[PDB]
Write a protein that binds this ligand. Structure first.
Ligand SMILES: CC(=O)N[C@@H]1[C@@H](O)[C@H](O[C@@H]2O[C@H](CO)[C@@H](O[C@@H]3O[C@H](CO)[C@@H](O[C@@H]4O[C@H](CO)[C@@H](O[C@@H]5O[C@H](CO)[C@@H](O)[C@H](O)[C@H]5NC(C)=O)[C@H](O)[C@H]4NC(C)=O)[C@H](O)[C@H]3NC(C)=O)[C@H](O)[C@H]2NC(C)=O)[C@@H](CO)O[C@H]1O
Length: 371
């Protein structure tokens, strides 16, 4: 059965006005799996709420899982880790049997108290960033998943992971067959392919080769097709591969506004959105409205990569719209993938300000998957 894995960045409740996105803004019938991001750990592996005022005191954990009262078939998971949590503590925790056991027991306790149906492990990433034990992380990550699976089978809980996409990244972190063996599915983060950290403009989630890229050694390029075909060939069965898609774009400052193709020189991060409020990225809800309200933007489609981009003076923006989302889900259908994972629900056009219905990206996913 095809699944739709909706990540919910819970900090979105602090956004103002039309950017505010609470648990009550979720449509629980547009997802099959809803993921509460994020919880974290300390250096001894103790699972902990990162925002206890919201998660615990104001009952956000329980409000989230209570969505099952509306859609009884919905699964609600909690996600541990993420970008801001780093890699060091997960490396330290994974390497010690005492710390693994403490992570298993304290995360299980939180999952059961607050009525979650499972755990999404988003360690970014084994043997990367500020990892402590380096290459040992790869095997110890799989040992952690095995001990988690052994504990979770006593309660019927789901165990899932979010992982880096392209081969150059994945080989640093995972033994693919061992990971796929223990999880219910693998959510491949097939986005952030390029971004403001690069010296040239590039697409956030290009499906295939992009304009300005060399067709020589195509398999080393950062795109969704390369990533998905890597993970399938490395040993992830299609029925455990969930393909990530972004509900946001990434923004660049052009070095020269007249050189505005993909793979043009860039000077760092571009505009920020009104609610996400970070230079270098913009929610789809924010940018479809920005495009709507300022006709000076030039929107083009990269017909090689199957994704749109837009420029105005010094701004250059890669993003995904209904057409590129359709292309992505059709691609996933065409390789019999298990489903779609989206980051993240709170930057869909949930108010429908952009003339394509409420939740146009999420509704597109549901519609193209259903067919
Ligand atoms: C091909 C290749 O390998 N390219 C890499 C590229 O991947 C690297 O970029 C990083 O990619 C990873 C995925 O592999 C990104 O991590 C994913 O994707 C989500 C969206 O990118 C990411 O969301 C971020 O989560 C942060 C928390 O961890 C959010 O911080 C929050 O900011 C809020 C204000 O906006 C604030 O209120 C919150 O308190 C704060 N949260 C916390 C707990 O502090 C951040 O806003 C959010 N970004 C969004 C929404 O756009 C997730 O963490 C993670 N998801 C999952 C499921 O794991 C990672 O974000 C990318 N890095 C950066 C810097 O963007 C790149 C590194 O430079 O290198 C390329 O080579």
């Amino acid at each position: 059965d095809k699944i739709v894995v909706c990540y919910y960045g819970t900090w979105a409740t602090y956004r103002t006005g039309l950017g505010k996105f609470d648990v009550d803004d979720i449509d629980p019938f547009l997802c099959t799996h809803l993921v509460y991001a994020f919880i974290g750990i300390n250096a001894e592996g103790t699972a902990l709420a990162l925002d206890p005022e919201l998660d615990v005191e104001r009952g956000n954990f329980k409000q989230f899982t209570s969505l099952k009262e509306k859609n009884p078939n919905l699964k609600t998971l909690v996600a541990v880790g993420g970008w801001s949590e780093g890699s060091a503590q997960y490396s330290i925790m994974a390497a010690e049997p005492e710390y693994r056991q403490n992570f298993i027991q304290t995360s299980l306790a939180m999952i059961l108290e607050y009525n979650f149906d499972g755990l999404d492990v988003d360690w970014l990433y084994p043997n990367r960033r500020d990892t402590v034990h380096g290459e040992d992380d790869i095997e110890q990550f799989s040992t952690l998943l095995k001990e988690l699976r052994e504990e979770f089978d006593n309660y019927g809980l789901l165990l899932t992971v979010a992982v880096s996409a392209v081969e150059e990244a994945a080989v640093q972190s995972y033994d693919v067959p061992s990971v796929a063996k223990y999880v219910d599915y693998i959510g491949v983060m097939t986005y952030d392919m390029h971004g403001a950290w690069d010296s040239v403009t590039g697409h956030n989630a290009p499906l295939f080769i992009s304009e300005g890229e060399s067709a020589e050694q195509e398999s080393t390029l950062y795109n969704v097709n390369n990533a998905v075909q890597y993970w399938l060939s490395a040993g992830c069965p299609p029925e455990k591969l969930v393909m990530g898609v972004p509900f946001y774009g990434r923004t660049f400052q052009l070095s020269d506004p007249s050189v505005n193709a993909p793979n043009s020189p860039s000077n760092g991060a571009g505009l920020a959105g009104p609610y996400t409020a970070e230079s270098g990225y913009v929610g789809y809800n924010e940018f479809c409205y920005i495009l709507q309200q300022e006709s000076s933007w030039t929107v083009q489609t990269d017909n090689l990569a199957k994704v749109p981009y837009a420029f105005l003076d010094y701004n250059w923006v890669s993003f995904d719209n209904v057409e590129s989302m359709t292309a992505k889900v059709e691609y996933a259908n065409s390789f019999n993938l298990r489903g779609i994972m989206l980051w993240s629900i709170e930057t869909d056009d949930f108010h429908g300000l952009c003339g394509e219905g409420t939740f146009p990206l999420l509704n597109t996913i549901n519609t193209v998957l259903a067919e």
